[PDB]
Symmetry: C2
Protein backbone atom coordinates (compact mmCIF):
# COMPACT_ATOMS: atom_id res chain seq x y z
CA UNK A 1 0.00 0.00 0.00
CA UNK A 2 1.39 3.36 -1.23
CA UNK A 3 1.77 6.03 1.53
CA UNK A 4 -0.17 9.29 1.14
CA UNK A 5 1.82 12.59 1.19
CA UNK A 6 -1.16 14.32 2.96
CA UNK A 7 -3.81 13.17 5.51
CA UNK A 8 -7.00 15.30 5.97
CA UNK A 9 -8.85 14.50 9.26
CA UNK A 10 -12.52 15.27 10.06
CA UNK A 11 -12.50 16.66 13.67
CA UNK A 12 -15.99 16.20 15.28
CA UNK A 13 -16.44 12.41 16.04
CA UNK A 14 -13.38 11.25 13.99
CA UNK A 15 -10.90 12.88 16.48
CA UNK A 16 -13.16 14.43 19.19
CA UNK A 17 -15.31 12.30 21.60
CA UNK A 18 -18.84 13.86 21.48
CA UNK A 19 -19.65 12.22 24.91
CA UNK A 20 -19.85 15.46 27.03
CA UNK A 21 -22.21 17.06 24.41
CA UNK A 22 -24.09 13.75 23.65
CA UNK A 23 -24.73 13.10 27.43
CA UNK A 24 -25.74 16.79 28.11
CA UNK A 25 -28.41 16.68 25.29
CA UNK A 26 -29.64 13.07 25.95
CA UNK A 27 -30.23 13.78 29.70
CA UNK A 28 -31.76 17.32 29.13
CA UNK A 29 -34.25 15.86 26.56
CA UNK A 30 -34.59 12.54 28.47
CA UNK A 31 -33.76 10.16 25.52
CA UNK A 32 -30.64 8.25 24.27
CA UNK A 33 -31.62 9.22 20.66
CA UNK A 34 -31.91 13.03 21.33
CA UNK A 35 -28.26 13.76 20.31
CA UNK A 36 -28.36 11.60 17.11
CA UNK A 37 -31.58 13.33 15.87
CA UNK A 38 -30.23 16.85 16.73
CA UNK A 39 -26.76 16.39 15.13
CA UNK A 40 -28.33 14.86 11.96
CA UNK A 41 -30.75 17.87 11.89
CA UNK A 42 -27.72 20.25 12.34
CA UNK A 43 -25.88 18.48 9.42
CA UNK A 44 -29.09 18.52 7.27
CA UNK A 45 -29.68 22.32 7.80
CA UNK A 46 -25.90 23.03 7.26
CA UNK A 47 -26.31 21.47 3.74
CA UNK A 48 -29.69 23.37 3.40
CA UNK A 49 -27.84 26.72 4.00
CA UNK A 50 -25.16 25.85 1.35
CA UNK A 51 -27.73 24.70 -1.31
CA UNK A 52 -29.76 27.95 -0.67
CA UNK A 53 -26.58 30.09 -1.28
CA UNK A 54 -26.01 31.10 2.39
CA UNK A 55 -23.46 30.39 5.18
CA UNK A 56 -24.17 30.36 8.95
CA UNK A 57 -21.49 29.44 11.52
CA UNK A 58 -21.90 25.81 12.79
CA UNK A 59 -22.52 26.91 16.42
CA UNK A 60 -25.48 29.12 15.34
CA UNK A 61 -27.18 26.32 13.27
CA UNK A 62 -26.51 24.01 16.27
CA UNK A 63 -28.52 26.35 18.59
CA UNK A 64 -31.43 26.80 16.07
CA UNK A 65 -31.68 22.98 15.46
CA UNK A 66 -31.44 22.25 19.24
CA UNK A 67 -34.49 24.57 19.86
CA UNK A 68 -36.36 22.67 17.04
CA UNK A 69 -35.24 19.23 18.43
CA UNK A 70 -36.14 19.94 22.12
CA UNK A 71 -39.83 20.47 21.09
CA UNK A 72 -40.10 17.00 19.52
CA UNK A 73 -39.15 15.62 23.00
CA UNK A 74 -41.80 17.85 24.71
CA UNK A 75 -39.10 19.94 26.53
CA UNK A 76 -38.82 23.78 26.51
CA UNK A 77 -35.35 24.66 27.95
CA UNK A 78 -34.34 28.27 28.84
CA UNK A 79 -31.67 29.99 26.69
CA UNK A 80 -29.18 29.82 29.66
CA UNK A 81 -29.51 25.99 29.60
CA UNK A 82 -29.30 25.62 25.75
CA UNK A 83 -26.04 27.73 25.90
CA UNK A 84 -24.71 25.56 28.82
CA UNK A 85 -25.47 22.30 26.88
CA UNK A 86 -23.98 23.60 23.55
CA UNK A 87 -20.93 24.90 25.53
CA UNK A 88 -19.76 21.22 25.59
CA UNK A 89 -18.82 21.58 21.84
CA UNK A 90 -15.68 23.51 23.09
CA UNK A 91 -14.93 20.85 25.82
CA UNK A 92 -14.69 17.61 23.75
CA UNK A 93 -11.66 15.51 24.77
CA UNK A 94 -9.73 13.59 22.04
CA UNK A 95 -10.51 9.85 21.61
CA UNK A 96 -8.00 7.75 23.60
CA UNK A 97 -6.34 6.42 20.36
CA UNK A 98 -5.87 9.69 18.36
CA UNK A 99 -2.72 11.24 19.96
CA UNK A 100 -0.70 7.97 19.48
CA UNK A 101 -2.07 7.59 15.91
CA UNK A 102 -1.21 11.22 14.90
CA UNK A 103 2.28 11.04 16.61
CA UNK A 104 3.01 7.84 14.56
CA UNK A 105 1.82 9.49 11.24
CA UNK A 106 3.69 12.83 11.84
CA UNK A 107 6.86 10.79 12.68
CA UNK A 108 6.60 8.97 9.27
CA UNK A 109 6.94 12.49 7.64
CA UNK A 110 3.24 12.64 6.53
CA UNK A 111 1.59 16.11 6.32
CA UNK A 112 -1.39 16.14 8.81
CA UNK A 113 -4.19 18.75 8.27
CA UNK A 114 -7.70 19.05 9.82
CA UNK A 115 -10.85 19.99 7.83
CA UNK A 116 -13.91 20.71 10.10
CA UNK A 117 -17.45 22.15 9.61
CA UNK A 118 -16.69 24.21 12.81
CA UNK A 119 -15.91 27.94 12.17
CA UNK A 120 -12.22 29.05 12.54
CA UNK A 121 -12.51 30.23 16.18
CA UNK A 122 -14.58 27.23 17.40
CA UNK A 123 -12.16 24.78 15.64
CA UNK A 124 -9.17 26.51 17.41
CA UNK A 125 -10.94 26.30 20.86
CA UNK A 126 -11.85 22.60 20.19
CA UNK A 127 -8.30 21.47 19.23
CA UNK A 128 -6.64 23.51 22.07
CA UNK A 129 -8.94 21.91 24.69
CA UNK A 130 -8.18 18.35 23.35
CA UNK A 131 -4.45 19.25 22.81
CA UNK A 132 -4.48 18.25 19.10
CA UNK A 133 -3.54 21.67 17.52
CA UNK A 134 0.26 20.95 17.55
CA UNK A 135 -0.12 17.67 15.52
CA UNK A 136 -1.46 19.50 12.41
CA UNK A 137 0.62 21.55 9.90
CA UNK A 138 -2.62 23.42 8.98
CA UNK A 139 -6.22 23.62 10.27
CA UNK A 140 -8.94 24.29 7.60
CA UNK A 141 -12.42 25.64 8.54
CA UNK A 142 -15.36 25.67 6.02
CA UNK A 143 -15.51 29.43 6.90
CA UNK A 144 -12.18 29.56 4.92
CA UNK A 145 -14.11 28.10 1.84
CA UNK A 146 -17.69 29.46 2.54
CA UNK A 147 -19.26 25.95 1.87
CA UNK A 148 -19.90 22.96 4.23
CA UNK A 149 -18.51 19.46 3.62
CA UNK A 150 -19.05 17.29 1.76
CA UNK A 151 -19.03 19.92 -1.05
CA UNK A 152 -16.18 18.99 -3.46
CA UNK A 153 -14.58 22.53 -3.37
CA UNK A 154 -13.85 22.06 0.43
CA UNK A 155 -11.50 19.03 -0.12
CA UNK A 156 -9.97 20.57 -3.35
CA UNK A 157 -9.17 23.89 -1.57
CA UNK A 158 -7.08 21.88 1.02
CA UNK A 159 -5.30 19.99 -1.87
CA UNK A 160 -4.29 23.18 -3.79
CA UNK A 161 -3.26 24.99 -0.54
CA UNK A 162 -1.02 22.10 0.68
CA UNK A 163 0.28 21.62 -2.97
CA UNK A 164 -0.50 17.83 -2.85
CA UNK A 165 -2.46 16.18 -5.72
CA UNK A 166 -5.77 14.36 -4.96
CA UNK A 167 -4.36 10.80 -5.59
CA UNK A 168 -1.57 11.32 -2.92
CA UNK A 169 -4.13 12.63 -0.31
CA UNK A 170 -6.19 10.38 2.05
CA UNK A 171 -9.30 11.66 3.94
CA UNK A 172 -9.80 10.18 7.48
CA UNK A 173 -13.45 10.43 8.63
CA UNK A 174 -15.93 8.66 10.97
CA UNK A 175 -18.78 9.93 8.66
CA UNK A 176 -20.11 8.02 5.61
CA UNK A 177 -20.93 11.37 3.86
CA UNK A 178 -17.40 12.76 4.49
CA UNK A 179 -15.97 9.52 2.89
CA UNK A 180 -18.44 9.91 -0.07
CA UNK A 181 -17.47 13.61 -0.67
CA UNK A 182 -13.66 13.05 -0.45
CA UNK A 183 -14.00 9.94 -2.72
CA UNK A 184 -15.84 12.07 -5.38
CA UNK A 185 -13.15 14.81 -5.04
CA UNK A 186 -10.54 12.15 -6.12
CA UNK A 187 -9.11 11.45 -2.62
CA UNK A 188 -8.20 8.10 -1.01
CA UNK A 189 -10.42 7.41 2.07
CA UNK A 190 -10.01 5.83 5.56
CA UNK A 191 -13.25 5.16 7.53
CA UNK A 192 -12.85 5.20 11.38
CA UNK A 193 -15.68 2.84 12.55
CA UNK A 194 -16.52 4.82 15.75
CA UNK A 195 -19.64 3.61 17.69
CA UNK A 196 -23.01 4.49 16.00
CA UNK A 197 -21.50 5.40 12.54
CA UNK A 198 -22.09 3.40 9.29
CA UNK A 199 -20.59 3.47 5.76
CA UNK A 200 -22.97 4.96 3.14
CA UNK A 201 -23.88 1.83 1.11
CA UNK A 202 -24.41 3.74 -2.24
CA UNK A 203 -20.79 3.90 -3.57
CA UNK A 204 -19.48 5.14 -0.15
CA UNK A 205 -17.01 2.21 0.47
CA UNK A 206 -13.64 3.60 1.66
CA UNK A 207 -10.14 2.31 0.63
CA UNK A 208 -9.40 1.36 4.33
CA UNK A 209 -11.66 0.60 7.32
CA UNK A 210 -10.35 0.56 10.92
CA UNK A 211 -11.83 0.98 14.39
CA UNK A 212 -9.47 3.73 15.72
CA UNK A 213 -7.12 6.41 14.22
CA UNK A 214 -4.24 4.40 15.82
CA UNK A 215 -5.46 1.35 13.80
CA UNK A 216 -5.51 3.56 10.61
CA UNK A 217 -1.91 4.71 11.39
CA UNK A 218 -0.79 1.03 11.85
CA UNK A 219 -2.47 -0.14 8.55
CA UNK A 220 -0.66 2.68 6.61
CA UNK A 221 2.75 1.89 8.30
CA UNK B 1 -53.93 38.88 1.40
CA UNK B 2 -53.35 38.64 -2.38
CA UNK B 3 -54.56 35.39 -3.96
CA UNK B 4 -51.61 33.46 -5.53
CA UNK B 5 -51.85 32.41 -9.27
CA UNK B 6 -49.93 29.14 -8.48
CA UNK B 7 -49.67 26.91 -5.35
CA UNK B 8 -46.74 24.40 -5.08
CA UNK B 9 -47.34 21.56 -2.55
CA UNK B 10 -44.65 19.41 -0.87
CA UNK B 11 -46.02 15.80 -1.06
CA UNK B 12 -44.32 13.54 1.61
CA UNK B 13 -45.72 15.06 4.88
CA UNK B 14 -47.58 18.21 3.77
CA UNK B 15 -50.21 16.04 1.92
CA UNK B 16 -49.47 12.31 2.65
CA UNK B 17 -49.75 10.84 6.18
CA UNK B 18 -46.39 9.04 6.82
CA UNK B 19 -48.25 6.90 9.47
CA UNK B 20 -47.91 3.52 7.66
CA UNK B 21 -44.12 4.04 7.03
CA UNK B 22 -43.49 5.64 10.48
CA UNK B 23 -45.26 2.72 12.31
CA UNK B 24 -43.58 0.02 10.10
CA UNK B 25 -40.08 1.47 10.98
CA UNK B 26 -40.66 2.33 14.70
CA UNK B 27 -42.08 -1.23 15.30
CA UNK B 28 -39.21 -2.93 13.37
CA UNK B 29 -36.45 -0.96 15.23
CA UNK B 30 -38.40 -0.90 18.55
CA UNK B 31 -38.23 2.91 19.17
CA UNK B 32 -40.65 5.84 18.57
CA UNK B 33 -37.59 7.95 17.39
CA UNK B 34 -36.38 5.46 14.67
CA UNK B 35 -38.52 7.07 11.87
CA UNK B 36 -37.37 10.65 12.71
CA UNK B 37 -33.65 9.66 12.75
CA UNK B 38 -33.90 7.59 9.51
CA UNK B 39 -35.89 10.21 7.55
CA UNK B 40 -33.52 13.04 8.67
CA UNK B 41 -30.61 10.74 7.61
CA UNK B 42 -32.39 10.14 4.24
CA UNK B 43 -32.76 13.96 3.68
CA UNK B 44 -29.12 14.59 4.83
CA UNK B 45 -27.68 12.04 2.29
CA UNK B 46 -30.07 13.37 -0.43
CA UNK B 47 -28.42 16.85 -0.13
CA UNK B 48 -25.00 15.07 0.18
CA UNK B 49 -25.69 13.44 -3.26
CA UNK B 50 -26.59 16.88 -4.83
CA UNK B 51 -23.55 18.69 -3.25
CA UNK B 52 -21.19 15.91 -4.60
CA UNK B 53 -22.50 16.33 -8.23
CA UNK B 54 -24.62 13.10 -8.29
CA UNK B 55 -28.35 12.08 -8.32
CA UNK B 56 -29.81 8.82 -6.81
CA UNK B 57 -33.60 8.11 -6.73
CA UNK B 58 -35.24 8.87 -3.30
CA UNK B 59 -36.27 5.19 -2.80
CA UNK B 60 -32.63 3.92 -3.12
CA UNK B 61 -31.23 6.50 -0.57
CA UNK B 62 -34.11 5.52 1.77
CA UNK B 63 -33.07 1.82 1.69
CA UNK B 64 -29.30 2.58 2.10
CA UNK B 65 -30.01 5.04 5.00
CA UNK B 66 -32.43 2.48 6.63
CA UNK B 67 -29.63 -0.19 6.60
CA UNK B 68 -27.39 2.47 8.30
CA UNK B 69 -30.16 3.48 10.83
CA UNK B 70 -31.19 -0.12 11.89
CA UNK B 71 -27.54 -0.85 12.98
CA UNK B 72 -27.72 2.12 15.35
CA UNK B 73 -30.81 0.43 17.03
CA UNK B 74 -28.96 -2.95 17.28
CA UNK B 75 -31.28 -4.67 14.71
CA UNK B 76 -30.22 -6.51 11.50
CA UNK B 77 -33.35 -6.71 9.24
CA UNK B 78 -33.37 -9.01 6.14
CA UNK B 79 -33.80 -7.49 2.60
CA UNK B 80 -37.36 -9.00 2.43
CA UNK B 81 -38.14 -7.13 5.70
CA UNK B 82 -36.55 -3.79 4.54
CA UNK B 83 -38.49 -3.94 1.19
CA UNK B 84 -41.79 -4.69 3.08
CA UNK B 85 -41.23 -1.66 5.43
CA UNK B 86 -40.09 0.64 2.54
CA UNK B 87 -43.07 -0.59 0.41
CA UNK B 88 -45.31 1.59 2.69
CA UNK B 89 -44.00 4.78 0.89
CA UNK B 90 -46.36 3.81 -2.02
CA UNK B 91 -49.34 3.25 0.36
CA UNK B 92 -49.55 6.61 2.20
CA UNK B 93 -53.11 7.95 2.54
CA UNK B 94 -53.81 11.72 2.25
CA UNK B 95 -54.21 13.66 5.57
CA UNK B 96 -58.01 14.06 6.30
CA UNK B 97 -57.94 17.84 5.56
CA UNK B 98 -56.18 17.64 2.13
CA UNK B 99 -58.92 16.62 -0.39
CA UNK B 100 -61.31 19.32 1.02
CA UNK B 101 -58.51 21.98 1.01
CA UNK B 102 -57.42 21.17 -2.60
CA UNK B 103 -61.06 21.19 -3.92
CA UNK B 104 -61.66 24.64 -2.35
CA UNK B 105 -58.45 26.05 -4.00
CA UNK B 106 -59.15 24.37 -7.42
CA UNK B 107 -62.71 25.85 -7.44
CA UNK B 108 -61.15 29.30 -6.69
CA UNK B 109 -59.38 28.71 -10.11
CA UNK B 110 -55.86 28.56 -8.56
CA UNK B 111 -53.31 26.38 -10.48
CA UNK B 112 -52.19 23.56 -8.13
CA UNK B 113 -48.90 21.65 -8.71
CA UNK B 114 -46.88 19.20 -6.57
CA UNK B 115 -43.04 19.30 -6.10
CA UNK B 116 -41.61 16.12 -4.40
CA UNK B 117 -38.10 14.65 -3.76
CA UNK B 118 -39.69 11.28 -4.82
CA UNK B 119 -38.80 10.16 -8.41
CA UNK B 120 -41.52 10.56 -11.14
CA UNK B 121 -42.76 6.88 -11.03
CA UNK B 122 -42.93 6.81 -7.17
CA UNK B 123 -44.61 10.29 -7.11
CA UNK B 124 -47.25 9.08 -9.62
CA UNK B 125 -47.89 5.87 -7.53
CA UNK B 126 -48.12 7.85 -4.20
CA UNK B 127 -50.70 10.42 -5.54
CA UNK B 128 -52.78 7.71 -7.34
CA UNK B 129 -53.04 5.65 -4.09
CA UNK B 130 -54.00 8.80 -2.06
CA UNK B 131 -56.42 9.80 -4.90
CA UNK B 132 -54.78 13.29 -5.10
CA UNK B 133 -53.41 13.07 -8.72
CA UNK B 134 -56.52 14.67 -10.36
CA UNK B 135 -56.25 17.86 -8.15
CA UNK B 136 -52.89 18.99 -9.73
CA UNK B 137 -52.41 20.44 -13.28
CA UNK B 138 -48.80 19.06 -13.17
CA UNK B 139 -46.61 16.99 -10.74
CA UNK B 140 -42.86 17.92 -10.64
CA UNK B 141 -40.26 15.35 -9.51
CA UNK B 142 -36.65 16.40 -8.65
CA UNK B 143 -35.75 13.80 -11.33
CA UNK B 144 -37.35 16.40 -13.73
CA UNK B 145 -34.78 18.99 -12.43
CA UNK B 146 -31.69 16.77 -11.53
CA UNK B 147 -31.44 18.39 -8.02
CA UNK B 148 -33.10 17.78 -4.60
CA UNK B 149 -35.07 20.45 -2.69
CA UNK B 150 -34.40 22.83 -1.18
CA UNK B 151 -32.03 23.81 -4.06
CA UNK B 152 -33.36 27.13 -5.48
CA UNK B 153 -33.25 25.74 -9.08
CA UNK B 154 -36.02 23.16 -8.15
CA UNK B 155 -38.68 25.85 -7.33
CA UNK B 156 -37.65 28.19 -10.26
CA UNK B 157 -38.00 25.22 -12.72
CA UNK B 158 -41.71 25.05 -11.62
CA UNK B 159 -42.26 28.88 -11.97
CA UNK B 160 -40.74 29.00 -15.51
CA UNK B 161 -42.63 25.82 -16.66
CA UNK B 162 -46.04 27.05 -15.27
CA UNK B 163 -45.34 30.60 -16.68
CA UNK B 164 -46.07 32.17 -13.22
CA UNK B 165 -43.76 34.77 -11.54
CA UNK B 166 -42.11 34.01 -8.12
CA UNK B 167 -44.15 36.72 -6.24
CA UNK B 168 -47.49 35.23 -7.57
CA UNK B 169 -46.47 31.66 -6.46
CA UNK B 170 -46.94 30.30 -2.90
CA UNK B 171 -45.07 27.16 -1.68
CA UNK B 172 -47.13 25.02 0.80
CA UNK B 173 -44.87 22.77 2.97
CA UNK B 174 -44.73 21.16 6.47
CA UNK B 175 -40.85 21.25 6.31
CA UNK B 176 -38.83 24.24 7.69
CA UNK B 177 -36.07 23.73 5.03
CA UNK B 178 -38.70 23.55 2.21
CA UNK B 179 -40.08 26.92 3.49
CA UNK B 180 -36.50 28.34 3.65
CA UNK B 181 -35.74 27.06 0.08
CA UNK B 182 -38.91 28.56 -1.49
CA UNK B 183 -38.51 31.82 0.51
CA UNK B 184 -34.94 32.36 -0.89
CA UNK B 185 -36.13 31.44 -4.46
CA UNK B 186 -38.49 34.50 -4.09
CA UNK B 187 -41.74 32.48 -3.55
CA UNK B 188 -44.51 33.15 -0.97
CA UNK B 189 -44.57 30.47 1.79
CA UNK B 190 -47.37 28.70 3.73
CA UNK B 191 -46.16 26.48 6.65
CA UNK B 192 -48.53 23.55 7.51
CA UNK B 193 -47.75 22.94 11.25
CA UNK B 194 -48.11 19.09 11.10
CA UNK B 195 -47.12 17.07 14.23
CA UNK B 196 -43.36 16.97 15.01
CA UNK B 197 -42.35 19.71 12.47
CA UNK B 198 -40.90 23.12 13.52
CA UNK B 199 -40.13 26.37 11.64
CA UNK B 200 -36.38 26.92 11.01
CA UNK B 201 -35.60 29.77 13.46
CA UNK B 202 -32.78 31.29 11.26
CA UNK B 203 -34.83 33.44 8.77
CA UNK B 204 -37.24 30.51 7.99
CA UNK B 205 -40.48 32.28 9.13
CA UNK B 206 -43.20 31.81 6.46
CA UNK B 207 -45.82 34.40 5.29
CA UNK B 208 -48.67 32.10 6.54
CA UNK B 209 -48.74 29.51 9.34
CA UNK B 210 -51.73 27.11 9.46
CA UNK B 211 -52.29 23.69 10.93
CA UNK B 212 -53.93 21.88 8.00
CA UNK B 213 -54.01 22.38 4.19
CA UNK B 214 -57.78 23.07 4.69
CA UNK B 215 -56.86 25.95 7.13
CA UNK B 216 -54.41 27.30 4.45
CA UNK B 217 -57.22 27.30 1.80
CA UNK B 218 -59.59 29.12 4.24
CA UNK B 219 -56.89 31.75 5.10
CA UNK B 220 -56.32 32.51 1.36
CA UNK B 221 -60.12 32.97 0.62
Amino acid sequence: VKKPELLIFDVNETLLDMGPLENAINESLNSEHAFSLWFRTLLHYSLTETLTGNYVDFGTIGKATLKMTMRKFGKNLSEDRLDAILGNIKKLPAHEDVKEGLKMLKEAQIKLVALSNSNGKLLNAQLQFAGLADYFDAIFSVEAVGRYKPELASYRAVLETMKVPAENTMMVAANGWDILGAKRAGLRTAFVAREGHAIYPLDGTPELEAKTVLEVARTLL
